[PDB]
Symmetry: D3
Subunit: 67 residues, 6 copies
């Protein structure tokens, strides 16, 4: 278990690979979408591809509130 309190299960619905990073779009429950930019190495290692079941993890101090 990791300290990051946001752990949202999702399915990949978009993937764009660059040279250093890749953009991963996950659909999570309720139809929300989360977009992640991570290293291309991690995409490759985790075998990220359309339909993959993965979890989006965000540290609490990175979540802003919009009112």
């Amino acid at each position: 278990s990791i300290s990051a309190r946001n752990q949202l299960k999702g399915k990949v619905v978009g993937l764009k690979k660059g040279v250093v990073t890749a953009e991963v779009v996950l659909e999570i429950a309720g139809g929300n979408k989360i977009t992640s930019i991570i290293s291309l190495d991690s995409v490759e290692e985790l075998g990220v591809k359309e339909g993959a079941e993965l979890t989006a993890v965000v540290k609490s101090t990175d979540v802003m509130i919009l009112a």
Copy 2:
């Protein structure tokens, strides 16, 4: 509009105020919960309180992927 692509609508179900920061917990669609730690100053200025409808925003580079 802001460049942060993740905007998750939610309702505050928990709030703990510290001296410098506060922890806000939002229930989002599908029952997922998002936890945010922001400055106490912002909580006050945005009038964040239990039950409030608000939106969590996260920059894509802050979203990690777990497999």
Copy 3:
């Protein structure tokens, strides 16, 4: 209103687009310059281009102090 307490108005003076991300340079008051790396999708969506008036937003917990 967003919780991020740093909101600096600026004008775009530099833009470099990659495949996933783009680098945006804003000149803010007093001659300071802020450089941002964000998703290319956002640049495109916000119509970022030289001279555009935009605001740089930074969460407090991301600001370091150098003495």
Copy 4:
């Protein structure tokens, strides 16, 4: 020199100490204010105090753009 491309000189106009963190407010050129939340331990070691001339540093990937 550090890779963080944003280095903004300023003067501390506010300081609030908590137990683990502290909020530092710096006035920068043009009157902009930058707000930083850092560890209390750092405030102590860098001798951060009201009126001190200090520099705020932000990594480019933490700067969002608002339009």
Copy 5:
């Protein structure tokens, strides 16, 4: 497995609890120390305490380079 490429095993040598967050200090291989500020809720749930063997994880986009 998670996309965050940096995973550093360590032993807790310091722990300071606040109301919202907690500061965890880990000694890692070679004697380097890593300092983490996470939510108090997580410290409790992961049962973080002095002497515990734990792993520090950091997303690559959060590591700055200083020369």
Copy 6:
């Protein structure tokens, strides 16, 4: 001196340059490896290259704990 409490001295053992960003892999004491994604401008400016002695700097609120 900078407020970020993690300052890990290391040597570059991997470098991959993209158009906006670059991935830098540093070996630090004890054989630990740190991977950083930073702006290509900074890579160029700091003259990052294999064997360079540099320091990985991470803010405490970016360090997660895995148990």
